[PDB]
Amino acid sequence: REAICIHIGQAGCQVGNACWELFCLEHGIQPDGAMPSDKTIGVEDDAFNTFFSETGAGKHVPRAVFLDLEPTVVDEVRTGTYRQLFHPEQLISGKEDAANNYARGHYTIGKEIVDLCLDRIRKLADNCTGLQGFLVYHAVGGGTGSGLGALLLERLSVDYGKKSKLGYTVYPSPQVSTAVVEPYNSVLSTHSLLEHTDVAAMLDNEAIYDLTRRNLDIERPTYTNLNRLIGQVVSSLTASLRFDGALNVDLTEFQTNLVPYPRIHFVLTSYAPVISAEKAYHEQLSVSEISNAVFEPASMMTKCDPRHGKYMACCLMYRGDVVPKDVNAAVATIKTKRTIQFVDWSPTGFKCGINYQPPTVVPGGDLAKVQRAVCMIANSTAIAEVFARIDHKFDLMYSKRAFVHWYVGEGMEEGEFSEAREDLAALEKDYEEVGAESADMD
Amino acid sequence: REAICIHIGQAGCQVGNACWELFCLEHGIQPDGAMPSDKTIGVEDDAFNTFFSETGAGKHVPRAVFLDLEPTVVDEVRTGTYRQLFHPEQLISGKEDAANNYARGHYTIGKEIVDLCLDRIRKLADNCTGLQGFLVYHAVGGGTGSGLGALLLERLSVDYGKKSKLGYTVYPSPQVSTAVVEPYNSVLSTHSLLEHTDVAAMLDNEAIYDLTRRNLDIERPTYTNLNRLIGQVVSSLTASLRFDGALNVDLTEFQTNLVPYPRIHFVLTSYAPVISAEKAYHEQLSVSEISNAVFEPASMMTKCDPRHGKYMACCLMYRGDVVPKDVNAAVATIKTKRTIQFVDWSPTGFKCGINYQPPTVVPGGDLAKVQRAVCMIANSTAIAEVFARIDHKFDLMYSKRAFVHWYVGEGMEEGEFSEAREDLAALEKDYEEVGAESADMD
Amino acid sequence: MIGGQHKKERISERLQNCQNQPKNRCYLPGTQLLTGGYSTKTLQGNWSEERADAGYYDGKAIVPTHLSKIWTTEYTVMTNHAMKRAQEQAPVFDQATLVDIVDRNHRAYPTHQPHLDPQLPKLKEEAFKTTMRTSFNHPQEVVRPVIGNTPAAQARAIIMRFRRQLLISMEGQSAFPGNVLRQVRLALERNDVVGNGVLNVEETFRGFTEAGVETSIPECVALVRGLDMKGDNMLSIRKVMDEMRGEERDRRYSIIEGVYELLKKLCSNGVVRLHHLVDLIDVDSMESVLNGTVSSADALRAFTTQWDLPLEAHISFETFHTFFRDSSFEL
Amino acid sequence: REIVCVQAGQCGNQIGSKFWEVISDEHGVDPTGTYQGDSDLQLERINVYFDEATGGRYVPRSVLIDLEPGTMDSVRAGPYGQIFRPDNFIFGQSGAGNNWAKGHYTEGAELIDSVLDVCCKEAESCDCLQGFQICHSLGGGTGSGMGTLLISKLREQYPDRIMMTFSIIPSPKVSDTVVEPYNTTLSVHQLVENSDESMCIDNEALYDICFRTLKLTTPTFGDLNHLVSAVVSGVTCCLRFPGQLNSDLRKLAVNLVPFPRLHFFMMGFAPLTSRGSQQYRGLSVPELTQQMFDAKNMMQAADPRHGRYLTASALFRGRMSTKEVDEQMLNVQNKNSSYFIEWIPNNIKSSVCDIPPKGLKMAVTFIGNNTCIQEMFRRVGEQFTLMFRRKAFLHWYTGEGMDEMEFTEAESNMNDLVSEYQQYQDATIE
Numbered sequence A, B: 001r002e003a004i005c006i007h008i009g010q011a012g013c014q015v016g017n018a019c020w021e022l023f024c025l026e027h028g029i030q031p032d033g034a035m036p037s038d039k040t041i042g043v044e045d046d047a048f049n050t051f052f053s054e055t056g057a058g059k060h061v062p063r064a065v066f067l068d069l070e071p072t073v074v075d076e077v078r079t080g081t082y083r084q085l086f087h088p089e090q091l092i093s094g095k096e097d098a099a100n101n102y103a104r105g106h107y108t109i110g111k112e113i114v115d116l117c118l119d120r121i122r123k124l125a126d127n128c129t130g131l132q133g134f135l136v137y138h139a140v141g142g143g144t145g146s147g148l149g150a151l152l153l154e155r156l157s158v159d160y161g162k163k164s165k166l167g168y169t170v171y172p173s174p175q176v177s178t179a180v181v182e183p184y185n186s187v188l189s190t191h192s193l194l195e196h197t198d199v200a201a202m203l204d205n206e207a208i209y210d211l212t213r214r215n216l217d218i219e220r221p222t223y224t225n226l227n228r229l230i231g232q233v234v235s236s237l238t239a240s241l242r243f244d245g246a247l248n249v250d251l252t253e254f255q256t257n258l259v260p261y262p263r264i265h266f267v268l269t270s271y272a273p274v275i276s277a278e279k280a281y282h283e284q285l286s287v288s289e290i291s292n293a294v295f296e297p298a299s300m301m302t303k304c305d306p307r308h309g310k311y312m313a314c315c316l317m318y319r320g321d322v323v324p325k326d327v328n329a330a331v332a333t334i335k336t337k338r339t340i341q342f343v344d345w346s347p348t349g350f351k352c353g354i355n356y357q358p359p360t361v362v363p364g365g366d367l368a369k370v371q372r373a374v375c376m377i378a379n380s381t382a383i384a385e386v387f388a389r390i391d392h393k394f395d396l397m398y399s400k401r402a403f404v405h406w407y408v409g410e411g412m413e414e415g416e417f418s419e420a421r422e423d424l425a426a427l428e429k430d431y432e433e434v435g436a437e438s439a440d441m442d
Numbered sequence C: 001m002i003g004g005q006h007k008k009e010r011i012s013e014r015l016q017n018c019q020n021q022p023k024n025r026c027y028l029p030g031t032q033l034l035t036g037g038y039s040t041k042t043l044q045g046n047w048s049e050e051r052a053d054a055g056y057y058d059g060k061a062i063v064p065t066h067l068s069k070i071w072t073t074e075y076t077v078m079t080n081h082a083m084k085r086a087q088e089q090a091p092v093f094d095q096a097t098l099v100d101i102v103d104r105n106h107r108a109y110p111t112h113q114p115h116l117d118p119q120l121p122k123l124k125e126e127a128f129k130t131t132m133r134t135s136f137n138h139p140q141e142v143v144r145p146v147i148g149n150t151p152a153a154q155a156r157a158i159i160m161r162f163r164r165q166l167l168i169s170m171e172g173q174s175a176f177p178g179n180v181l182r183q184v185r186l187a188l189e190r191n192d193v194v195g196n197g198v199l200n201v202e203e204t205f206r207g208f209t210e211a212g213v214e215t216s217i218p219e220c221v222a223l224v225r226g227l228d229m230k231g232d233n234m235l236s237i238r239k240v241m242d243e244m245r246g247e248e249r250d251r252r253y254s255i256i257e258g259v260y261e262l263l264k265k266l267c268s269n270g271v272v273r274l275h276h277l278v279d280l281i282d283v284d285s286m287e288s289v290l291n292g293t294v295s296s297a298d299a300l301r302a303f304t305t306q307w308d309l310p311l312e313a314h315i316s317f318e319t320f321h322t323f324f325r326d327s328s329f330e331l
Numbered sequence D: 001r002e003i004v005c006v007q008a009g010q011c012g013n014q015i016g017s018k019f020w021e022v023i024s025d026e027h028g029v030d031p032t033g034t035y036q037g038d039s040d041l042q043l044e045r046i047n048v049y050f051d052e053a054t055g056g057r058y059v060p061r062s063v064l065i066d067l068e069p070g071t072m073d074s075v076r077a078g079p080y081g082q083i084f085r086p087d088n089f090i091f092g093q094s095g096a097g098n099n100w101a102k103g104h105y106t107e108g109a110e111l112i113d114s115v116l117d118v119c120c121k122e123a124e125s126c127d128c129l130q131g132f133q134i135c136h137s138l139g140g141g142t143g144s145g146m147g148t149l150l151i152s153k154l155r156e157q158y159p160d161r162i163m164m165t166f167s168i169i170p171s172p173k174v175s176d177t178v179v180e181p182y183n184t185t186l187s188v189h190q191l192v193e194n195s196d197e198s199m200c201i202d203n204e205a206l207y208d209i210c211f212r213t214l215k216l217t218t219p220t221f222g223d224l225n226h227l228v229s230a231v232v233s234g235v236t237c238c239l240r241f242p243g244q245l246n247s248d249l250r251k252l253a254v255n256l257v258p259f260p261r262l263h264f265f266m267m268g269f270a271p272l273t274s275r276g277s278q279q280y281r282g283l284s285v286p287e288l289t290q291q292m293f294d295a296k297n298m299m300q301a302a303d304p305r306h307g308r309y310l311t312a313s314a315l316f317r318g319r320m321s322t323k324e325v326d327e328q329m330l331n332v333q334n335k336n337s338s339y340f341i342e343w344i345p346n347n348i349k350s351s352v353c354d355i356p357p358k359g360l361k362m363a364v365t366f367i368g369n370n371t372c373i374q375e376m377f378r379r380v381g382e383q384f385t386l387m388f389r390r391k392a393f394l395h396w397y398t399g400e401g402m403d404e405m406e407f408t409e410a411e412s413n414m415n416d417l418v419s420e421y422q423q424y425q426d427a428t429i430e
């Protein structure tokens, strides 16, 4: 009934700010950790427990840790408005950044900070009675996110063992780029994430920019918009643990239904009613329109075209005023479509969830208020095209050792590049073999 | 008719508060000693006489003494709510404690206090016309309870002679513990108690904590709960003297039916309908159900398992709406069971008592209100396990003369340890011989 | 507190010519609380703990400057909406309490700050309590689960509590059953001020307090929010009274409809009026009049008054139904 | 049951001022000495530490002794200084000079009779006298020499009562005085024979408490003396308030000392938390017990993890369930079984008192008998052997009149104390 959140580096902490703003506003906790007198009268409830724990005086404090090697973002949290919400021990900051070097985070600098992080997570996990997983937020393009995320996931995976770990990861977009060394860091990160993660959700900033231009009418978006959309997605996936519903979905059921083979755990994510107030008042939004919307590539938050592959499993979460018979009719209509294809070894391709709590509206937000929404996470062979493009960029730079001397200076053998590149090549071959159209009877 | 209660030390005074609260509320005496005069009563009544005496003005005063060497607990009783109920001479207090030393209570300090206690007991025994025994409450783990209890029982046994003495002692729990020197005090107490006691009811705190966690729904119990359960047991045992019934049982009948040989007087206790108010309305509580309950070890108030021994005698007291035919059917069903075994020299193993007064409910209490209850005291060879473990801990400490300099310095010969340890060895053999089925007869 | 005035030199210190370090108060020139070689304004060393002090003060003028408006961070723009609401309330002390805080008088350990503990007064009342005094007082002196944070759940729980309170209280019992809910409805109607039949939080509180139900302002806030279906914080009297009547069982509905269908056929053109009901009723057959505790004339008079209509008013099925749901509440 | 306090030397007088502030606050005594409390529960045991003055006033049963009046003028000038009885201040006209022999033999024998006269006048006034409590430093001059002289005389005159000492011992990292090893060695030799129970404190441990746990930026001696005043006032709480399981100094000694020489104990006090964090974590019995056994929270530099506990005692203050206390002590004994001496079946005694210190819901004070006390004395003996072989400063002591044979006797006795602790550390059942 409980989940612990770990935020790493700049993208992970900034997305965390939007997530905790949303979870506070959805439950009704004030920025100072208190809860108004009228929310706590007449009835006694426990739904906050998934994300907050209360002290004996009734203050709420959240179940999260913030990890960074540079102080600036955590110092912004320490001096901002939510200063009193977080426990000060949870906000951990080092002296200097990993400077876009995976080697600096993993070998040289993260090795000093990792034991404090493990001590905080242990002190939190001992004060729990139904921990049901870890949520991790990080970007694989930067040095500290890749290196310290890998080292911390390895240590967590040995100490806690079988417990599930779900990651939300921002991968380098196919043509917008911010730093030169992104391919090396992304390959080396992906090598560690293969062994130590149960489900990995892939995000690309170029898709969220396209979605914000096409559906909403925003010509000049900034990171706060993207982070609020990611927060809505995380709230949709975790709503099944916190509110009443017709068909609940426990976090272990996602892992049981979505992963066919132990390496095939990378999933695509999309969200349906991203809409502005002027369009929202011109249209009805019944179940069948949003179900048809989630399968169009204009709705996805990752830059991939699912028409170039085959689906293996889809998990559809409906929240708000929806009745199961329309979900069944919608899924049967989607199944009828000819441009949507499932692998022939997966005949029963769908998992459904239905929750009664509608999505919350944030005062400065840009989404409209709507009675229902659906969020989808799905496993498809199309993801193999993203890795092939990362491998092409790695091959171009590595053929001449373009920047390797930094990595070798900070403690890494040149051999580790070839090992990671061969492991990701094997992942590409796994997606080629698993997606085989048919096997011969002879 | 009359009985005198002797309370010694901390456990005995605190258990006395719960006992006298119950006896007042059951008879109807207010905390100021005066019964409500009402309009009138149709016929004259006398049941209180067992525990109260009336003054010419109609005030009631109780037949009890409270003995302690430290003032704090008795001054706490003197300043509490029942200040006007007790006679001030009855609350006797010394200046300083026996400091967990049996030697300080027995040789140095109790010798000063015993003559005041004997003068008070003499003044009580002179104001009686049918005294039929002493009830004693004390703990053998502490210094003053063991030392002064033994010295006072010796003096009472010489002055009053044949009069019966029944003890409700609290022996040390098998793994929960409060003080380091508990084995020495318990062994030295048991040596004196063996020769000068007629029936020893033995109680442990770990069993009453287990009973309050499993049957009642209390996560964090405290001594007031345990003391109220003990008070209920004492009220059940003394009800046979105070109210009308089908089969009464005088205190001499317990000794005649329960004690086969003069040293075999250690007994186990068990109480059936320990239940909460919310559970009580979903279940019937028939005679056979509570009779089946009293034989399960989860119902016992001492930490021993009777399946590892043989019963020698059982005395069953039923109070409330019970009919003798149901008691007979229940006892015949228990007798049918294969996991309950009696020694072959005891064919008629049961004594029954039936009283019409149902158990009283105390305003702050945690037990539900019920129409019937049963209480059991039984003699079994499984009580040998309780001693062997105390003796083993004594042997472990005495092999290195642990703390011995305190006992020898305060006035006791080192020889006193060896005699008592040999006497408890003889008690272990008494339990071996009594439990032997038969010899090689023709 | 505003402007400092508790970090400054006191008169006693000036008269005694006190120096700095015996008490370590940084007010004398050349001495300052330096954390990491810098002041607390700079983020070095132990600034977070020193900013958590009870007597800490930051030199920020209330009147803002222009460059503060011009220079803003993206995080500040994101989280400024909550900051405006969160800046409304803050604890305050007088000068004597600030003297006590600076002098750190009553503390268990050097860092104990009792003035920042919100549960201090109940701790003070709770102090000096003994186990026996609590547990051995004078013996004479001493719910359907609802799940969810939804306001509908709160409204349902509050309605159930109100119904239980009215049943245990039972004020205004008449000669003919059905006067309790009538009194509650009349009390609510009397405190309406506009005439359109709607109430806000404060008038709801006054009305339910007059009706005999003990409540509080948060109860009324929760109830009005839960029962609101048009987003104006107005409470409809009809809706709340319908919820107070409750769900109706099938047998009672069957009897009511059967009696109404019988009464419909004895009138002309199938129109039933209130004088029909007054004439045709058989009041001397109730158990309360045959046993000998209520007179028949009083019972008929009580029945006629409870309708709150003239004797020629048309009594539809809705009015008959509502009247006898009100009466079934007491049986 | 009344206690008599003696404060000796600069450290003792300074710690005493903070102790009497804490005790006067807990019983609601105004700094003028007037009772201003708000519950009768405060008054019924006021006699334990206070004597009754005529109208409203109460006077504290304490003797102040020093060889130069500088400290006495400082304590009289303090915020609670007025409460002390004028006749209880005994002072000479020249300092101890940091020399044990001067403080013990020349000015000691000159003043000691007036101090014994004051202690007897104070002792014979009690209706029933409990043990004495002594605060002093071992590294100083008048504290060590005259304190141990007075301890020996009171043990001769009142051998059946309890003798309790709180003692300050030189830090391993920075010395405040060059001749600390001689004064420390002679004082430990006197204490091991004379004392009934002795508590030891390192100033370095209090600095580590302040910096790591309380995160104070600029701690001062007032903070160290407040932590010490907290534990000293906490150990006696069950003597002077009601509770579910009363306890006493003699009962603590009977449960803590297995053999008469093993009477040196370590101390700790549990609720410690930084000013920023206290709003974020509620008090509970698991939190108090876990901090209570953490070696970071212990007031000596030796750490328990290198030794084994022979015995320990915990006194809890507050209204709480006994089941949680018992099960916590069982869980700690079972999970860390290798750190407890196996030939004793239960090493922890518990006691429960109803009234916590003001502003705290619950508190516990911990007293521990651990073999790691041998490490402090061995280090002091090393510094003594380096200085003594070369007669580094011996002419001062010989000039006062001491024979060199006292130094060899004191060294031998301390070495035997270290040996006895080491043998019980490595003892086995066989």
Ligand SMILES: Nc1nc2c(ncn2[C@@H]2O[C@H](COP(=O)(O)OP(=O)(O)OP(=O)(O)O)[C@@H](O)[C@H]2O)c(=O)[nH]1
Pocket: A008, A009, A010, A011, A012, A014, A015, A069, A070, A097, A098, A099, A100, A101, A139, A141, A142, A143, A144, A145, A146, A170, A172, A178, A205, A223, A226, A227
């Ligand atoms: N959606 C989103 N993307 C971000 C955010 N911040 C950075 N990114 C993206 O993540 C990548 C940069 O990763 P960083 O998080 O800056 O790397 P890092 O974790 O700080 O690692 P170091 O530079 O060594 O400290 C780029 O592709 C950025 O566009 C953010 O707040 N939201």
Ligand SMILES: Nc1nc2c(ncn2[C@@H]2O[C@H](COP(=O)(O)OP(=O)(O)OP(=O)(O)O)[C@@H](O)[C@H]2O)c(=O)[nH]1
Pocket: B008, B009, B010, B011, B012, B014, B015, B069, B070, B097, B098, B099, B100, B101, B139, B141, B142, B143, B144, B145, B146, B170, B172, B178, B205, B223, B226, B227, D245
């Ligand atoms: N069930 C129960 N056990 C108690 C109670 N009070 C104390 N005990 C237990 O009895 C033992 C302590 O014995 P005490 O009564 O305190 O010893 P004492 O008689 O005061 O002896 P001295 O300490 O020398 O004064 C421990 O095991 C306590 O757990 C009580 O009220 N109920």
Ligand SMILES: Nc1nc2c(ncn2[C@@H]2O[C@H](COP(=O)(O)OP(=O)(O)O)[C@@H](O)[C@H]2O)c(=O)[nH]1
Pocket: D008, D009, D010, D011, D012, D014, D015, D096, D098, D137, D139, D140, D141, D142, D143, D144, D168, D170, D176, D203, D221, D224, D225
């Ligand atoms: N904890 C503590 N230590 C002190 C205090 N005052 C002095 N000391 C220490 O005690 C030693 C000096 O001993 P001192 O009291 O001057 O000896 P005296 O000259 O005989 O009184 C040094 O180690 C000081 O650091 C104090 O208030 N608290």
Ligand SMILES: [Mg+2]
Pocket: A009, A010, A070, A097, A142, A144
């Ligand atoms: Mg960075």
Ligand SMILES: [Mg+2]
Pocket: B009, B010, B070, B097, B098, B142, B144, D246
């Ligand atoms: Mg006692």
